[model samples]
Target chain A: MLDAFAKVVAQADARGEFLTNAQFDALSNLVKEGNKRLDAVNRITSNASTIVANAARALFAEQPQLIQPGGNAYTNRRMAACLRDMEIILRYVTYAILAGDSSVLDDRCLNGLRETYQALGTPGSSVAVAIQKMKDAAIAIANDPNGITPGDCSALMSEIAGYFDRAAAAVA
Target chain B: MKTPITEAIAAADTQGRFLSNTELQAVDGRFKRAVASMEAARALTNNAQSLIDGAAQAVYQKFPYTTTMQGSQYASTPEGKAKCARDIGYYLRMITYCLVAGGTGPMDEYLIAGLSEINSTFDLSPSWYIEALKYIKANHGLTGQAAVEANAYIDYAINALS
Candidate 1:
């Protein structure tokens, strides 16, 4: 595992070593949506924890509200975990490319995505399906006509958000 | 041993809040340096691993052996094959050294070159390398003070990697 991590770092470092500035910027944008969503999910989880802490003092007590919010704290916890995995997938993709090099953005990032997919716990868990969707997004990017447009990245992230909704609904 | 960023992240998790701007900034500063240093160290380890790969190639070319026992075919001889076996052992140690200590040995020019081995990279797992380290320490004269030194280093490196 340590060696695998070292390899991961080596790949990230190689990206740092050899990209054109514009290329890096485009790749960086590809992850921005996922990163922003992960941050938002993190904030929601924190606030929910606070509400749970005051559960006894809380009124009317929608058991399902904090239990499941938007409302289940446990359910949200799972969603947040899934979202984090999504963020990791995006980061891996962002670092997998080289500007003006034989770089298919999906080429190297697919390995990490598939690894994360296999480790998403149960075979048919909501998170696992989300990971598969991410894999689909990568494949679609590979199959694009002009290849790798900003619209492609936007659609990919939007597709990832679909799972957040599914996870929230899974608990509801 | 504990850095502020780790502690800061812990605090955020414990208190149920996203990290604040101030916390994020401090973490960015310290964590960036710490990560850079670790990558530098492992990049060095990567370099040392390549050296072993090269040495193994040279030794195998000379001995033309298929098995570890065949290595003894060279070791028992009193020719250039004999010297090749000794060279293999020493190179193997240099490669294994980083797995245990993580490039913490003498900050010489070669070690510094390791710090910059960031381009055109490769990484193979170090689980098997631990076997070589054990064999070297047990079979070689690494007992006594030398063993003691290997037993201790960085509150975390040996603990985490080994």
Candidate 2:
């Protein structure tokens, strides 16, 4: 999935054209929808698992031993499953954002993507701080629309390449 | 109790008026799948707050510090790393809980928006080192010599996040 998404993004980057207003609008909409779906999935799965755990506990209340182990196992298993699905959805969304015209990876969008990646990589990180940084970056980019020189783009590309390398290595 | 996050996205798409049917359908399908998962998770953790007490409360107490990767990686010392990790882990868990309960809402948009900004910054700026320092001074409340070390940790978090 990542590969597929990356291919689209790479194609856009190679073309070096800004997204048409329509295209940008479409991509943004898609991202919003994707996020919504992900959020829904998280809610449903977590809530369902919680209900199941609660029921099991009720059924085994008289037999403490019967419920404790099973309850923990159930909760953990549910969490693991939810995480797995969340990660998958997140990857697709990330890809969609990347696949958009490189220009759409505007300062505001880019900062958002960066923070999303950061939060995902290390769960429990600060969204507020990320947002603040993103806001600052957006302002800087806006003030200097041409701030991203060719060299800057290349360096960032290199960093992305390195990121993929590390991710691949971790899996290997 | 759906939070309209999905609806908001759909609205955004409609307003943008640009996606092909194929893309739109794909987005819908993925969104539905995610919704299913979130619903299921919400069912599981509804009353686990009791179980989440004590250690759980401690986790929530540390929520503010855990939201940013840079902060998580920049605990004062090696010993603080463990605390940082714990706080972050718990914070994520809490977010998951909220996701399951509230459905997707404006909060998710805020999150994605933040991430997009981060990606663009690196793409445009060459001085990540200086950028890190600035981020620390502004967001993390570091000062003096301590701020110097922030760059390394910020770089580490960015690399990891990327």
Candidate 3:
């Protein structure tokens, strides 16, 4: 597969008919870099998943309104949808993480991000600012080619925790 | 579905527009067969995704991840397969809707337009469309020509949906 990609890349390069050895090595490095970045996004996801669980407990507490039609108090669209949306959107954030293309941002991940916020619902006064911060962080993550660094990963998940905390407080 | 396509097909000309009764049967047979090939491709897409995921896991992750495995979509290996699945699922539905709805309206036309953008010569009345789809199924999300095939379907599907 990459043989063909290499050929195409070489063809397009104005320098020569093929990529230099260094350039080819860089492509391989790109893959390595992608996997490393994916770790950060997934780390964020791992942390957020824990935070979401906390939110879900609070969710069934106060936001039974957002539950799916057939769901019980313990489960609803908000719980199911937001968690599943997190998985899907995080999956694609890995998309941008790899290749570092970030095209997935505008192409697919953007809508997934929007869906997550919408699934999260209109945040109450307690969580409004925190949820907004998380949402903003998501958009920024989507557009950045470097994706999230370790710092961003830490910061992002902390914000997610903040949102979940506020939501829990709102319910209490 | 194939009504207008067949209508246009029946009137198709390369200095060879008119179709006898037997010829009509032949065209219908291939068209139906081509649709069957597409159906096969759809199912194949699901299987292909599983295989891609499994292969990535087997080769990469030594143990199942308690948190997130290397094969998780967060990583590149399984991400490829996920993208392929997403791409194929979208296109397969669009194509099925166009072919099954039994009319070649703006919607079907939308499907037709998308199919054209991918493989410009796509014609259900011909077997090549089946061949192309098989190739796509066999090499979905692969890097070279396979990548092109995978992406063409994706690009076309997204365009139609948009």
Best of the two (1, 3) by DockQ: 1
Candidate 2 lDDT by residue in tens digits, B1-162: 123233333343345422233444554554454443343333323323332333333432454342333532334444444554443333233333232322332223323236446546533222322333233224433344333333333344344344
List the pairs of residues colliding in candidate 1: A67-A72, A67-A73, A68-A71, A68-A72, A69-A72
**Which 10-residue window of candidate 2 chain A scores lowest in summed lDDT?**
A1-10
Q: Give the per-residue lDDT digits (tens) of candidate 1, residues B1-162.
A: 123433444455455444555655553343333333333333333344344444444444443442243333233345434454444444343322332213333212122244324211423123323333343333333343333433332222323334
TM-score of the A-chain for all models:
0.27, 0.23, 0.36
Mind sharing the TM-score for model 2? 0.21
Error of 2 at A133 (Å): 46
Whole-structure CA lDDT of model 1:
0.35
TM-score of each: 0.26, 0.21, 0.26
Cα lDDT for residue B43, candidate 3 = 41
Order the candidate numbers by DockQ, best to worst.
1, 2, 3
lDDT string, candidate 3, B20-90, tens digits = 33433443343443333333333434454354443434323432341253433323445644643443333
Query: Which is better, 1 or 3, measured by lDDT?
Result: 3
- The regions of model 2 sitting more than 4 angstroms off are A1-172, B1-18, B47-51, B54-94, B97-162
